[PDB]
mmCIF file of all heavy atoms in Angstrom:
data_model
loop_
_atom_site.group_PDB
_atom_site.id
_atom_site.type_symbol
_atom_site.label_atom_id
_atom_site.label_comp_id
_atom_site.label_asym_id
_atom_site.label_seq_id
_atom_site.Cartn_x
_atom_site.Cartn_y
_atom_site.Cartn_z
ATOM 1 N N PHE A 1 17.702 -26.623 -18.078
ATOM 2 C CA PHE A 1 17.070 -25.319 -18.415
ATOM 3 C C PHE A 1 16.174 -24.813 -17.240
ATOM 4 O O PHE A 1 15.814 -25.570 -16.392
ATOM 5 C CB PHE A 1 16.238 -25.445 -19.648
ATOM 6 C CG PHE A 1 15.012 -26.303 -19.513
ATOM 7 C CD1 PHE A 1 13.768 -25.697 -19.078
ATOM 8 C CD2 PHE A 1 15.018 -27.673 -19.748
ATOM 9 C CE1 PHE A 1 12.672 -26.528 -18.846
ATOM 10 C CE2 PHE A 1 13.977 -28.488 -19.461
ATOM 11 C CZ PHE A 1 12.754 -27.912 -19.100
ATOM 12 N N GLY A 2 15.846 -23.517 -17.445
ATOM 13 C CA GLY A 2 14.960 -22.859 -16.436
ATOM 14 C C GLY A 2 13.912 -22.107 -17.283
ATOM 15 O O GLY A 2 13.989 -22.044 -18.504
ATOM 16 N N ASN A 3 12.893 -21.550 -16.598
ATOM 17 C CA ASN A 3 11.828 -20.849 -17.282
ATOM 18 C C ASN A 3 11.725 -19.395 -16.840
ATOM 19 O O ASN A 3 12.091 -19.040 -15.711
ATOM 20 C CB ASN A 3 10.432 -21.435 -16.884
ATOM 21 C CG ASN A 3 10.278 -22.895 -17.165
ATOM 22 O OD1 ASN A 3 9.458 -23.635 -16.571
ATOM 23 N ND2 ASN A 3 11.029 -23.376 -18.209
ATOM 24 N N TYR A 4 11.281 -18.543 -17.778
ATOM 25 C CA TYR A 4 11.122 -17.134 -17.422
ATOM 26 C C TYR A 4 9.750 -16.695 -18.120
ATOM 27 O O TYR A 4 9.312 -17.187 -19.105
ATOM 28 C CB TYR A 4 12.281 -16.280 -17.800
ATOM 29 C CG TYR A 4 12.404 -15.748 -19.237
ATOM 30 C CD1 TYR A 4 11.580 -14.665 -19.646
ATOM 31 C CD2 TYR A 4 13.317 -16.327 -20.109
ATOM 32 C CE1 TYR A 4 11.765 -14.176 -20.965
ATOM 33 C CE2 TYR A 4 13.483 -15.748 -21.385
ATOM 34 C CZ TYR A 4 12.713 -14.699 -21.868
ATOM 35 O OH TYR A 4 12.824 -14.198 -23.109
ATOM 36 N N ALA A 5 9.193 -15.680 -17.415
ATOM 37 C CA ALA A 5 7.915 -15.139 -17.933
ATOM 38 C C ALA A 5 7.927 -13.594 -17.889
ATOM 39 O O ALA A 5 8.299 -13.094 -16.871
ATOM 40 C CB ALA A 5 6.770 -15.661 -17.081
ATOM 41 N N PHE A 6 7.623 -12.965 -18.965
ATOM 42 C CA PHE A 6 7.634 -11.495 -18.973
ATOM 43 C C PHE A 6 6.377 -11.085 -18.137
ATOM 44 O O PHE A 6 5.274 -11.683 -18.378
ATOM 45 C CB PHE A 6 7.519 -11.001 -20.410
ATOM 46 C CG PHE A 6 7.735 -9.474 -20.488
ATOM 47 C CD1 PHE A 6 8.943 -8.961 -20.865
ATOM 48 C CD2 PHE A 6 6.692 -8.582 -20.192
ATOM 49 C CE1 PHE A 6 9.171 -7.544 -20.968
ATOM 50 C CE2 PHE A 6 6.935 -7.176 -20.233
ATOM 51 C CZ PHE A 6 8.162 -6.702 -20.659
ATOM 52 N N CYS A 7 6.537 -10.244 -17.157
ATOM 53 C CA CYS A 7 5.395 -9.852 -16.313
ATOM 54 C C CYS A 7 4.566 -8.732 -16.817
ATOM 55 O O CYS A 7 5.151 -7.662 -17.229
ATOM 56 C CB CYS A 7 5.935 -9.509 -14.899
ATOM 57 S SG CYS A 7 6.777 -10.903 -14.069
ATOM 58 N N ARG A 8 3.303 -8.801 -16.775
ATOM 59 C CA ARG A 8 2.372 -7.760 -17.144
ATOM 60 C C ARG A 8 1.129 -7.649 -16.314
ATOM 61 O O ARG A 8 0.125 -7.245 -16.698
ATOM 62 C CB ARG A 8 1.926 -8.076 -18.636
ATOM 63 C CG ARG A 8 3.036 -7.821 -19.666
ATOM 64 C CD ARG A 8 2.572 -8.080 -21.029
ATOM 65 N NE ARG A 8 3.647 -7.715 -21.996
ATOM 66 C CZ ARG A 8 4.062 -6.541 -22.338
ATOM 67 N NH1 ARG A 8 3.482 -5.458 -21.772
ATOM 68 N NH2 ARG A 8 5.031 -6.308 -23.197
ATOM 69 N N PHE A 9 1.333 -8.097 -14.998
ATOM 70 C CA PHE A 9 0.213 -8.063 -14.026
ATOM 71 C C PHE A 9 -0.194 -6.540 -13.688
ATOM 72 O O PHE A 9 0.687 -5.663 -13.680
ATOM 73 C CB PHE A 9 0.537 -8.787 -12.788
ATOM 74 C CG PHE A 9 2.004 -8.646 -12.284
ATOM 75 C CD1 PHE A 9 2.382 -7.415 -11.734
ATOM 76 C CD2 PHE A 9 2.884 -9.646 -12.370
ATOM 77 C CE1 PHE A 9 3.659 -7.245 -11.286
ATOM 78 C CE2 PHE A 9 4.237 -9.497 -11.934
ATOM 79 C CZ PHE A 9 4.620 -8.299 -11.367
ATOM 80 N N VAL A 10 -1.482 -6.384 -13.576
ATOM 81 C CA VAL A 10 -2.015 -5.055 -13.288
ATOM 82 C C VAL A 10 -2.515 -4.816 -11.780
ATOM 83 O O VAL A 10 -3.005 -3.729 -11.500
ATOM 84 C CB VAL A 10 -3.162 -4.658 -14.253
ATOM 85 C CG1 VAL A 10 -2.645 -4.695 -15.656
ATOM 86 C CG2 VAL A 10 -4.309 -5.720 -14.024
ATOM 87 N N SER A 11 -2.474 -5.844 -10.968
ATOM 88 C CA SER A 11 -2.885 -5.874 -9.600
ATOM 89 C C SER A 11 -2.277 -7.001 -8.875
ATOM 90 O O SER A 11 -1.734 -7.974 -9.495
ATOM 91 C CB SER A 11 -4.387 -5.837 -9.508
ATOM 92 O OG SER A 11 -4.925 -7.098 -9.884
ATOM 93 N N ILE A 12 -2.418 -7.073 -7.591
ATOM 94 C CA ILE A 12 -1.968 -8.159 -6.807
ATOM 95 C C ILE A 12 -2.664 -9.415 -7.160
ATOM 96 O O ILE A 12 -2.007 -10.575 -7.404
ATOM 97 C CB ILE A 12 -2.274 -7.890 -5.265
ATOM 98 C CG1 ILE A 12 -1.479 -6.730 -4.794
ATOM 99 C CG2 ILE A 12 -1.908 -9.095 -4.417
ATOM 100 C CD1 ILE A 12 0.015 -6.934 -4.871
ATOM 101 N N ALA A 13 -4.041 -9.419 -7.334
ATOM 102 C CA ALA A 13 -4.765 -10.580 -7.737
ATOM 103 C C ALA A 13 -4.337 -11.008 -9.118
ATOM 104 O O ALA A 13 -4.191 -12.223 -9.378
ATOM 105 C CB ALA A 13 -6.286 -10.275 -7.679
ATOM 106 N N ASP A 14 -4.166 -10.073 -10.035
ATOM 107 C CA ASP A 14 -3.787 -10.401 -11.428
ATOM 108 C C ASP A 14 -2.349 -11.012 -11.462
ATOM 109 O O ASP A 14 -2.007 -11.826 -12.309
ATOM 110 C CB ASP A 14 -3.841 -9.173 -12.303
ATOM 111 C CG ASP A 14 -3.721 -9.436 -13.733
ATOM 112 O OD1 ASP A 14 -4.585 -10.271 -14.240
ATOM 113 O OD2 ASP A 14 -2.805 -8.860 -14.347
ATOM 114 N N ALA A 15 -1.500 -10.564 -10.540
ATOM 115 C CA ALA A 15 -0.145 -11.085 -10.421
ATOM 116 C C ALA A 15 -0.137 -12.623 -10.024
ATOM 117 O O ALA A 15 0.557 -13.383 -10.585
ATOM 118 C CB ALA A 15 0.688 -10.373 -9.369
ATOM 119 N N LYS A 16 -1.080 -12.979 -9.137
ATOM 120 C CA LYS A 16 -1.239 -14.375 -8.754
ATOM 121 C C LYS A 16 -1.743 -15.068 -9.948
ATOM 122 O O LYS A 16 -1.288 -16.304 -10.145
ATOM 123 C CB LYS A 16 -2.142 -14.417 -7.540
ATOM 124 C CG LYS A 16 -1.660 -13.745 -6.310
ATOM 125 C CD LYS A 16 -2.578 -13.856 -5.130
ATOM 126 C CE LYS A 16 -2.096 -13.143 -3.916
ATOM 127 N NZ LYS A 16 -3.020 -13.129 -2.752
ATOM 128 N N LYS A 17 -2.564 -14.618 -10.686
ATOM 129 C CA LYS A 17 -3.110 -15.277 -11.879
ATOM 130 C C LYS A 17 -1.962 -15.473 -12.915
ATOM 131 O O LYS A 17 -1.878 -16.542 -13.489
ATOM 132 C CB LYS A 17 -4.213 -14.446 -12.499
ATOM 133 C CG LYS A 17 -4.900 -15.133 -13.761
ATOM 134 C CD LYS A 17 -5.460 -16.475 -13.321
ATOM 135 C CE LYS A 17 -6.363 -17.046 -14.493
ATOM 136 N NZ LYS A 17 -5.532 -17.299 -15.679
ATOM 137 N N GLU A 18 -1.220 -14.413 -13.175
ATOM 138 C CA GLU A 18 -0.155 -14.574 -14.117
ATOM 139 C C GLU A 18 0.857 -15.707 -13.623
ATOM 140 O O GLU A 18 1.311 -16.488 -14.492
ATOM 141 C CB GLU A 18 0.686 -13.292 -14.283
ATOM 142 C CG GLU A 18 -0.054 -12.180 -15.037
ATOM 143 C CD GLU A 18 0.882 -11.400 -15.945
ATOM 144 O OE1 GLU A 18 2.119 -11.331 -15.685
ATOM 145 O OE2 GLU A 18 0.366 -10.765 -16.901
ATOM 146 N N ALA A 19 1.139 -15.748 -12.326
ATOM 147 C CA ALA A 19 2.002 -16.854 -11.830
ATOM 148 C C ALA A 19 1.400 -18.156 -12.014
ATOM 149 O O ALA A 19 2.091 -19.122 -12.415
ATOM 150 C CB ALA A 19 2.242 -16.596 -10.330
ATOM 151 N N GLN A 20 0.103 -18.303 -11.859
ATOM 152 C CA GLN A 20 -0.567 -19.585 -12.050
ATOM 153 C C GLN A 20 -0.473 -19.950 -13.501
ATOM 154 O O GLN A 20 -0.212 -21.174 -13.820
ATOM 155 C CB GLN A 20 -2.029 -19.472 -11.633
ATOM 156 C CG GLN A 20 -2.263 -19.396 -10.071
ATOM 157 C CD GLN A 20 -3.555 -18.755 -9.712
ATOM 158 O OE1 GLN A 20 -4.502 -18.672 -10.468
ATOM 159 N NE2 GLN A 20 -3.646 -18.404 -8.487
ATOM 160 N N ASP A 21 -0.695 -19.044 -14.456
ATOM 161 C CA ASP A 21 -0.571 -19.349 -15.880
ATOM 162 C C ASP A 21 0.866 -19.780 -16.215
ATOM 163 O O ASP A 21 1.049 -20.731 -16.917
ATOM 164 C CB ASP A 21 -0.920 -18.147 -16.690
ATOM 165 C CG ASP A 21 -2.451 -17.817 -16.663
ATOM 166 O OD1 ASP A 21 -3.237 -18.698 -16.348
ATOM 167 O OD2 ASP A 21 -2.827 -16.660 -17.004
ATOM 168 N N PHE A 22 1.809 -19.077 -15.613
ATOM 169 C CA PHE A 22 3.231 -19.387 -15.831
ATOM 170 C C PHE A 22 3.555 -20.834 -15.386
ATOM 171 O O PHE A 22 4.142 -21.607 -16.160
ATOM 172 C CB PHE A 22 4.065 -18.400 -15.035
ATOM 173 C CG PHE A 22 5.584 -18.502 -15.197
ATOM 174 C CD1 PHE A 22 6.150 -19.016 -16.295
ATOM 175 C CD2 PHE A 22 6.305 -18.012 -14.107
ATOM 176 C CE1 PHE A 22 7.528 -19.057 -16.390
ATOM 177 C CE2 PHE A 22 7.726 -18.065 -14.236
ATOM 178 C CZ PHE A 22 8.311 -18.579 -15.360
ATOM 179 N N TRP A 23 3.150 -21.187 -14.163
ATOM 180 C CA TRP A 23 3.393 -22.444 -13.669
ATOM 181 C C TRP A 23 2.701 -23.557 -14.448
ATOM 182 O O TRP A 23 3.309 -24.577 -14.770
ATOM 183 C CB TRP A 23 2.835 -22.560 -12.162
ATOM 184 C CG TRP A 23 3.032 -23.827 -11.476
ATOM 185 C CD1 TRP A 23 2.062 -24.709 -11.133
ATOM 186 C CD2 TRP A 23 4.312 -24.350 -10.904
ATOM 187 N NE1 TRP A 23 2.584 -25.776 -10.462
ATOM 188 C CE2 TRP A 23 3.932 -25.579 -10.299
ATOM 189 C CE3 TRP A 23 5.605 -23.936 -10.979
ATOM 190 C CZ2 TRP A 23 4.916 -26.356 -9.686
ATOM 191 C CZ3 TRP A 23 6.519 -24.675 -10.332
ATOM 192 C CH2 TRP A 23 6.245 -25.861 -9.720
ATOM 193 N N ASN A 24 1.466 -23.384 -14.824
ATOM 194 C CA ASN A 24 0.724 -24.411 -15.605
ATOM 195 C C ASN A 24 1.262 -24.565 -17.035
ATOM 196 O O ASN A 24 1.268 -25.674 -17.511
ATOM 197 C CB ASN A 24 -0.741 -24.023 -15.675
ATOM 198 C CG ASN A 24 -1.423 -24.137 -14.315
ATOM 199 O OD1 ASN A 24 -1.164 -25.141 -13.528
ATOM 200 N ND2 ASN A 24 -2.308 -23.227 -13.968
ATOM 201 N N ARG A 25 1.813 -23.467 -17.638
ATOM 202 C CA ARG A 25 2.295 -23.569 -18.945
ATOM 203 C C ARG A 25 3.833 -23.980 -19.031
ATOM 204 O O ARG A 25 4.241 -24.508 -20.097
ATOM 205 C CB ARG A 25 2.194 -22.180 -19.657
ATOM 206 C CG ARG A 25 0.761 -21.693 -19.894
ATOM 207 C CD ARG A 25 0.726 -20.322 -20.227
ATOM 208 N NE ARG A 25 -0.675 -19.812 -20.502
ATOM 209 C CZ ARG A 25 -1.076 -18.609 -20.597
ATOM 210 N NH1 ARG A 25 -0.184 -17.598 -20.482
ATOM 211 N NH2 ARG A 25 -2.303 -18.336 -20.952
ATOM 212 N N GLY A 26 4.518 -23.802 -17.952
ATOM 213 C CA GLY A 26 5.904 -24.097 -17.931
ATOM 214 C C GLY A 26 6.203 -25.611 -17.600
ATOM 215 O O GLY A 26 5.365 -26.246 -16.968
ATOM 216 N N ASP A 27 7.240 -26.138 -18.201
ATOM 217 C CA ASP A 27 7.638 -27.488 -17.989
ATOM 218 C C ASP A 27 8.238 -27.612 -16.555
ATOM 219 O O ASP A 27 9.005 -26.840 -16.198
ATOM 220 C CB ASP A 27 8.644 -27.998 -19.034
ATOM 221 C CG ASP A 27 8.885 -29.471 -19.029
ATOM 222 O OD1 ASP A 27 8.096 -30.131 -19.828
ATOM 223 O OD2 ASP A 27 9.686 -29.996 -18.292
ATOM 224 N N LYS A 28 7.755 -28.641 -15.888
ATOM 225 C CA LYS A 28 8.171 -28.833 -14.496
ATOM 226 C C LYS A 28 9.596 -29.428 -14.365
ATOM 227 O O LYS A 28 10.126 -29.536 -13.156
ATOM 228 C CB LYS A 28 7.171 -29.763 -13.796
ATOM 229 C CG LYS A 28 5.739 -29.310 -13.908
ATOM 230 C CD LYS A 28 5.612 -27.817 -13.465
ATOM 231 C CE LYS A 28 4.120 -27.328 -13.502
ATOM 232 N NZ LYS A 28 3.559 -27.300 -14.955
ATOM 233 N N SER A 29 10.308 -29.618 -15.448
ATOM 234 C CA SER A 29 11.671 -30.109 -15.356
ATOM 235 C C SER A 29 12.634 -28.850 -15.200
ATOM 236 O O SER A 29 13.868 -29.058 -15.056
ATOM 237 C CB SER A 29 12.041 -30.893 -16.575
ATOM 238 O OG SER A 29 11.452 -32.211 -16.583
ATOM 239 N N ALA A 30 12.033 -27.680 -15.336
ATOM 240 C CA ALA A 30 12.878 -26.433 -15.144
ATOM 241 C C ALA A 30 13.502 -26.468 -13.743
ATOM 242 O O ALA A 30 12.859 -26.865 -12.801
ATOM 243 C CB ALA A 30 11.975 -25.234 -15.344
ATOM 244 N N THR A 31 14.705 -25.980 -13.677
ATOM 245 C CA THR A 31 15.412 -25.865 -12.368
ATOM 246 C C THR A 31 15.128 -24.580 -11.675
ATOM 247 O O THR A 31 15.151 -24.538 -10.421
ATOM 248 C CB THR A 31 16.894 -26.008 -12.510
ATOM 249 O OG1 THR A 31 17.433 -24.975 -13.350
ATOM 250 C CG2 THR A 31 17.311 -27.350 -13.094
ATOM 251 N N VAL A 32 14.725 -23.555 -12.456
ATOM 252 C CA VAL A 32 14.434 -22.217 -11.858
ATOM 253 C C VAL A 32 13.215 -21.542 -12.625
ATOM 254 O O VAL A 32 12.973 -21.950 -13.832
ATOM 255 C CB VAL A 32 15.605 -21.260 -11.897
ATOM 256 C CG1 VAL A 32 16.820 -21.901 -11.185
ATOM 257 C CG2 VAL A 32 16.003 -20.927 -13.338
ATOM 258 N N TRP A 33 12.568 -20.707 -11.938
ATOM 259 C CA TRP A 33 11.423 -19.954 -12.591
ATOM 260 C C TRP A 33 11.704 -18.460 -12.329
ATOM 261 O O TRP A 33 11.964 -18.035 -11.151
ATOM 262 C CB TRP A 33 10.122 -20.372 -11.861
ATOM 263 C CG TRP A 33 9.753 -21.762 -12.075
ATOM 264 C CD1 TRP A 33 10.390 -22.823 -11.546
ATOM 265 C CD2 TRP A 33 8.755 -22.320 -12.869
ATOM 266 N NE1 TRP A 33 9.785 -23.990 -11.917
ATOM 267 C CE2 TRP A 33 8.815 -23.721 -12.821
ATOM 268 C CE3 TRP A 33 7.791 -21.699 -13.759
ATOM 269 C CZ2 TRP A 33 7.964 -24.541 -13.498
ATOM 270 C CZ3 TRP A 33 6.947 -22.566 -14.504
ATOM 271 C CH2 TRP A 33 7.012 -23.990 -14.344
ATOM 272 N N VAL A 34 11.680 -17.648 -13.354
ATOM 273 C CA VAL A 34 11.942 -16.206 -13.282
ATOM 274 C C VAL A 34 10.820 -15.286 -13.625
ATOM 275 O O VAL A 34 10.192 -15.407 -14.666
ATOM 276 C CB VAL A 34 13.177 -15.954 -14.179
ATOM 277 C CG1 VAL A 34 13.546 -14.397 -14.183
ATOM 278 C CG2 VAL A 34 14.389 -16.704 -13.758
ATOM 279 N N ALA A 35 10.713 -14.221 -12.787
ATOM 280 C CA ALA A 35 9.822 -13.110 -13.012
ATOM 281 C C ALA A 35 10.663 -12.081 -13.808
ATOM 282 O O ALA A 35 11.620 -11.587 -13.317
ATOM 283 C CB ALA A 35 9.312 -12.592 -11.731
ATOM 284 N N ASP A 36 10.208 -11.868 -15.021
ATOM 285 C CA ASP A 36 10.915 -10.951 -15.924
ATOM 286 C C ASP A 36 10.184 -9.588 -15.968
ATOM 287 O O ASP A 36 9.199 -9.473 -16.634
ATOM 288 C CB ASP A 36 11.013 -11.532 -17.347
ATOM 289 C CG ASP A 36 11.498 -10.623 -18.343
ATOM 290 O OD1 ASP A 36 12.172 -9.591 -18.047
ATOM 291 O OD2 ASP A 36 11.370 -10.937 -19.571
ATOM 292 N N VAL A 37 10.767 -8.646 -15.212
ATOM 293 C CA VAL A 37 10.212 -7.326 -15.045
ATOM 294 C C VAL A 37 10.865 -6.238 -15.807
ATOM 295 O O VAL A 37 12.013 -5.870 -15.495
ATOM 296 C CB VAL A 37 10.131 -6.866 -13.481
ATOM 297 C CG1 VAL A 37 9.535 -5.529 -13.309
ATOM 298 C CG2 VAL A 37 9.324 -7.946 -12.752
ATOM 299 N N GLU A 38 10.212 -5.712 -16.804
ATOM 300 C CA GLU A 38 10.751 -4.637 -17.686
ATOM 301 C C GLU A 38 9.918 -3.445 -17.930
ATOM 302 O O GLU A 38 10.397 -2.391 -18.393
ATOM 303 C CB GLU A 38 11.198 -5.228 -19.026
ATOM 304 C CG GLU A 38 12.306 -6.343 -18.829
ATOM 305 C CD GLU A 38 12.647 -6.989 -20.154
ATOM 306 O OE1 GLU A 38 12.847 -6.258 -21.201
ATOM 307 O OE2 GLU A 38 12.709 -8.264 -20.214
ATOM 308 N N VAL A 39 8.624 -3.564 -17.714
ATOM 309 C CA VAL A 39 7.669 -2.448 -17.891
ATOM 310 C C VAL A 39 6.751 -2.238 -16.767
ATOM 311 O O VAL A 39 6.357 -3.231 -16.147
ATOM 312 C CB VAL A 39 6.891 -2.632 -19.226
ATOM 313 C CG1 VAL A 39 7.770 -2.666 -20.388
ATOM 314 C CG2 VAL A 39 5.992 -3.875 -19.106
ATOM 315 N N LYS A 40 6.366 -1.008 -16.501
ATOM 316 C CA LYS A 40 5.400 -0.680 -15.419
ATOM 317 C C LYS A 40 3.937 -1.073 -15.856
ATOM 318 O O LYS A 40 3.457 -0.484 -16.805
ATOM 319 C CB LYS A 40 5.463 0.763 -15.098
ATOM 320 C CG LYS A 40 4.449 1.254 -14.043
ATOM 321 C CD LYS A 40 4.471 2.686 -13.863
ATOM 322 C CE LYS A 40 3.425 3.190 -12.833
ATOM 323 N NZ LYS A 40 3.462 4.599 -12.682
ATOM 324 N N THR A 41 3.370 -2.045 -15.208
ATOM 325 C CA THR A 41 1.982 -2.503 -15.516
ATOM 326 C C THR A 41 1.007 -2.164 -14.315
ATOM 327 O O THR A 41 -0.177 -2.319 -14.467
ATOM 328 C CB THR A 41 1.941 -3.880 -15.915
ATOM 329 O OG1 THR A 41 2.736 -4.672 -15.032
ATOM 330 C CG2 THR A 41 2.450 -4.135 -17.379
#
């Protein structure tokens, strides 16, 4: 399996924070990590 996260960042700094949360919450056995972009934030 792989991991995906719906993106809702509101700035560059906030994007780095969302990525950090994604990484920390995701299982490290994932083979891929995906940025899921569907709405303008």
Side-chain angles (χ1 to χ4, degrees):
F1 70 89
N3 298 158
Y4 83 77
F6 190 99
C7 299
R8 290 182 174 287
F9 43 70
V10 300
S11 71
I12 296 297
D14 192 56
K16 297 180 181 178
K17 182 61 170 61
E18 289 217 337
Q20 287 159 18
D21 290 339
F22 180 29
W23 181 251
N24 293 318
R25 295 165 177 169
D27 193 89
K28 308 307 183 295
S29 287
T31 60
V32 303
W33 297 72
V34 177
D36 172 17
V37 178
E38 297 177 46
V39 298
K40 174 186 179 182
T41 44

